[PDB]
Design a protein around this ligand. Structure first.
Ligand SMILES: [Cl-]
Ligand SMILES: [Cl-]
Ligand SMILES: [K+]
Ligand SMILES: [Mg+2]
Ligand SMILES: [Mg+2]
Ligand SMILES: [Mg+2]
Ligand SMILES: [Mg+2]
Ligand SMILES: [Mg+2]
Ligand SMILES: [Mg+2]
Ligand SMILES: [Mg+2]
Ligand SMILES: [Mg+2]
Ligand SMILES: [Mg+2]
Ligand SMILES: [Mg+2]
Ligand code: NA
Ligand code: NA
Ligand code: NA
Ligand code: NA
Ligand code: NA
Ligand code: NA
Ligand code: NA
Ligand code: NA
Ligand code: NA
Ligand code: NA
Ligand code: NA
Ligand code: NA
Ligand code: NA
Lengths: 65, 194, 56, 46, 81, 119
RNA sequence: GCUUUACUGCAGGCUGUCGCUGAG
RNA sequence: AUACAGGGUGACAACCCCGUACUCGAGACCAGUACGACGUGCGGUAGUGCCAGAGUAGCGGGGGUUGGAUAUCCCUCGCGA
RNA sequence: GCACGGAGGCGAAGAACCAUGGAUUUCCGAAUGAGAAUCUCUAACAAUUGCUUCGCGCAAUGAGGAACCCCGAGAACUGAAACAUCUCAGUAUCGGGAGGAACAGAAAACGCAAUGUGAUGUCGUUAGUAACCGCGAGUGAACGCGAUACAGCCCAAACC
């Protein structure tokens, strides 16, 4: 959603990796908040975070990194 | 004029006479100390081989195989058997020793396929046959207009299906007429009565 | 001693276990052979024609 | 008995499958766990 | 590729270790060694790992008790997540 | 071995091969057992060479007697590849035939004599 | 299931012969 | 209505909905086949005993198999053009 | 998703959904570096092979699959109103192996004997005929004919 395919393709191999490691962190912090019975959740995103990471990984592969 | 080959053939018509007789007596001594399946650089009976399909080419292999002589090495029945079926000494397998050789040779070279085979003698308890195998994956054979047919997938494991020379012969498929009623097109299709 | 109830008491030996290959609990840990799929004995899978009616 | 890491994983899964169908699924399906296994009454594999 | 740290194991006992012993507990990938857990931990939270204790749980997961150096403070490191 | 009834001294063999080389250049030679056999049969062979390291021996067994009942002279060579090389081949050769020597009909004729004497 | 000089066969043991197998 | 096959729809539906007749499109199989073409060269006369697949053809012992009987097919032992 | 809850989210940046193609595709598993009840130990075509730059460099095999197919091994209950040959039956079951079909196949054939037919399967018939058999119980073709579909070729050798 908030992160579309075009935008991923408009990134440089280095920006994808930086974005990648960024999403991963948001994800990890989401799981922590969840692991702590944290209610300030928004289920729709922890799900999107996974998909976004998938897309980036998919693109990194299509572009050759 | 006579080919040089014709001589090798003439000699092998009476393997117990003249020079070949002495050769055998010599050879067999080394053969007896050799294994079950031994690849040999050249065919002992060159005329034969070439006549079977042999070619001094890449992808063509020849091997001598040693098999024990005689009838079925058959375990007696451990339960109820009518007299007729109580047999052990006189039963003999329905596949000939030459065919056993082909299979043994072939198993030794899993990637190769049996082209043909011929006998090269026997002593008191062995029988030896030389098998001609072919490497269906080696170009030069893939590209040989005379052997490329064996490369076909339909030919995987010819021997084990009796597609061989001795295979068809042993299956009773020699005659096209009288007597092959229960033979053609297959033993199994004819209820196995030949 | 009764071969019955009283002889059931010594049965605390482990034999057939969860098979790595077929997932059945038929891997005889002492034989290292699966009684279900043949793993450990045959590369090909265990199977027999008598596992069903002759015409089926 | 001495359990291996694998064995331990399996027993663990078995324990987890031993939970009940969550209440919400009842409501979502407008209306049973047939794989309920008691440690004493039932026997696991291996 | 699998990641080393899965998430923070937060339970009453985990709290006690954190408040009284300066330790952090985590759910980690069971293929991870103490060494790997130590490194992964330092790089993610920028601290100094002093010791790691592991346990393969009856939950199918691996738990790591990570003690930080007196220089670092578990209570704080954990408060930002 | 079984078809070899007399040993040819190293030196004789050398004179033989040498003659063979000049034969391919000055005269005519047949390379290979089959071609050789036909020379002896067609009578066009003057001197035939037979290797002693041939396996199987069947390939050559016939040369001797065949050449005897055709009057054709023959000599043994130890190495199969030397005969091949001498005949001008990159490969070995179990048997060769000097079909009408060349600038060697002399040396040759005499090798034939030396062998006949070698019994 | 068992037995035997019940019937018929089968291993196995003994023995002759042929092949392996040659010289005086 | 070239559509009255069948189904759905709060009860028995050609005309409420899906579809059905008609027409049309796509994929797969037929098939790397048929047809077409490229290269090659078929065939005939006279002369010539140059060539043409061996443990084979064939015989005997013993077994198995077959409708195969003397006259099936196969295996084994021995002999062998 | 089945799955009709709660919360939240995605979709006109054309989502859901469908087709085709592509990415990802843990561990065991033929399971192939080695060991192991799905894990572990310190680079790996393990094993057997072909080719070979003789170095795992280039390749092959392995195992699956509903039955069908081909090659091997091969019962007994039963029938014969007992039972041995015979029958059940080359059935059941076992070992090996191929393909999308297998197998067979261009006559050392047939032998309505001919001035005749003309590769091979299969279907129908020929026929329960010929043939077998304690000549008992049983067993049991083929040539030909009518159809289906059609297709004919390559070596070995001579001479080079
Ligand atoms: Cl094969
Ligand atoms: Cl006719
Ligand atoms: K019976
Ligand atoms: Mg008892
Ligand atoms: Mg619990
Ligand atoms: Mg520990
Ligand atoms: Mg019978
Ligand atoms: Mg392994
Ligand atoms: Mg009866
Ligand atoms: Mg009667
Ligand atoms: Mg058929
Ligand atoms: Mg019958
Ligand atoms: Mg007939
Ligand atoms: Na093979
Ligand atoms: Na038969
Ligand atoms: Na229990
Ligand atoms: Na967890
Ligand atoms: Na009894
Ligand atoms: Na016989
Ligand atoms: Na996949
Ligand atoms: Na491989
Ligand atoms: Na290699
Ligand atoms: Na009766
Ligand atoms: Na009775
Ligand atoms: Na009878
Ligand atoms: Na007629």
């Amino acid at each position: 959603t908030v992160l579309h395919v075009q935008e991923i393709r408009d990134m440089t191999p280095a920006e994808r990796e930086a974005e990648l490691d960024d999403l991963k962190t948001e994800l990890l912090n989401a799981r922590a908040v969840q692991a702590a019975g944290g209610a300030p959740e928004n289920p729709g995103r922890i799900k999107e975070l996974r998909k976004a990471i998938a897309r980036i990984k998919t693109i990194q592969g299509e572009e050759g990194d | 004029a006579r080919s040089a080959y014709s001589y090798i053939r003439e000699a092998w018509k009476r393997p117990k006479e003249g020079q070949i007789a002495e050769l055998m007596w010599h050879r067999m001594q080394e053969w007896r100390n050799e294994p079950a399946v031994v690849r040999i650089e050249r065919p002992t009976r060159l005329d034969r081989a070439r006549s079977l399909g042999y070619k001094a080419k890449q992808g063509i292999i020849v091997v001598r195989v040693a098999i024990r002589k005689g009838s079925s090495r058959r375990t007696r029945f451990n339960k109820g058997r009518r007299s007729k079926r109580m047999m052990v000494n006189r039963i003999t397998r329905k596949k000939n020793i030459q065919r056993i050789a082909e299979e043994r040779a072939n198993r030794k070279f899993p990637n190769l396929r049996v082209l043909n085979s011929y006998s090269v003698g026997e002593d008191g308890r062995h029988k030896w046959h030389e098998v001609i195998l072919i490497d269906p994956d080696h170009p030069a054979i893939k590209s040989d207009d005379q052997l490329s047919w064996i490369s076909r997938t339909r030919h995987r494991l010819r021997t084990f299906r009796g597609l061989t020379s001795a295979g068809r012969r042993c299956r009773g498929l020699r005659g096209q007429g009288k007597g092959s009623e229960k033979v053609r097109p297959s033993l199994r299709v004819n209820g196995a009565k030949a | 001693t009764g071969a019955g109830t009283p002889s059931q008491g010594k049965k605390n030996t482990t034999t057939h276990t969860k098979c790595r290959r077929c997932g059945e609990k038929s891997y005889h840990t002492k034989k290292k052979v699966c009684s279900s799929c043949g793993f450990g004995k045959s590369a090909k899978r265990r199977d027999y024609e008598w596992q069903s009616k002759a015409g089926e | 008995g001495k359990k291996s890491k694998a064995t331990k994983k399996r027993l663990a899964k078995l324990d987890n499958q031993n939970s009940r169908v969550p209440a919400w699924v009842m409501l979502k399906t407008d209306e049973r766990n047939h794989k309920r296994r008691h440690w004493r009454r039932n026997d696991t594999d291996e | 590729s699998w990641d080393v740290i899965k998430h923070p194991h937060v339970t009453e006992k985990a709290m006690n270790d954190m408040d009284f012993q300066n330790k952090l507990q985590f759910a980690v990938d069971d293929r991870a060694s103490k060494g790997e857990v130590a490194d992964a931990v330092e790089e993610q939270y920028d601290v100094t790992v002093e010791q790691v204790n592991t346990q393969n749980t009856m939950d199918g997961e691996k738990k790591a008790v990570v003690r930080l150096s007196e220089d670092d403070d578990a209570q704080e490191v954990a408060s930002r997540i | 071995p079984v078809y070899v009834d007399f040993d040819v001294p190293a030196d004789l063999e050398d004179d033989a091969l040498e003659a063979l080389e000049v034969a391919r250049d000055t005269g005519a030679v047949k390379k290979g057992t089959n071609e050789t056999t036909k020379s002896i049969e067609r009578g066009s062979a003057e001197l035939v060479f037979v290797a002693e390291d041939v396996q199987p021996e069947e390939i050559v067994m016939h040369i001797p007697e065949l050449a005897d009942e055709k009057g054709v002279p023959f000599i043994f060579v130890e190495q199969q590849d030397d005969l091949g090389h001498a005949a001008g081949l990159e490969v070995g050769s179990a048997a060769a035939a000097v079909t009408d020597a060349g600038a060697a009909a002399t040396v040759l004729e005499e090798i034939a004599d030396k062998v006949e004497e070698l019994r």
